Amino acid sequence: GMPRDPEQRYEQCQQQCERQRRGQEQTLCRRRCEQRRQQEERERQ
DSSP states (O other): OOSSOHHHHHHHHHHHHHHHOOSSHHHHHHHHHHHHHHHHHHSOO
16 A cells, blocks of 8 residues: 555544544544545545
8 A cells, every 4th residue: 555554644543533532532533533534535636
């Protein structure tokens, strides 16, 4: 796919998902950060 380990990307995800809401961050952060990525890809350019 691309260079750089998934963990570093998740670290960035942790900062953004944490800001929007706190609690049960493990499942919530992974889903919220990842779903944003899907939206970003569909967003033109």
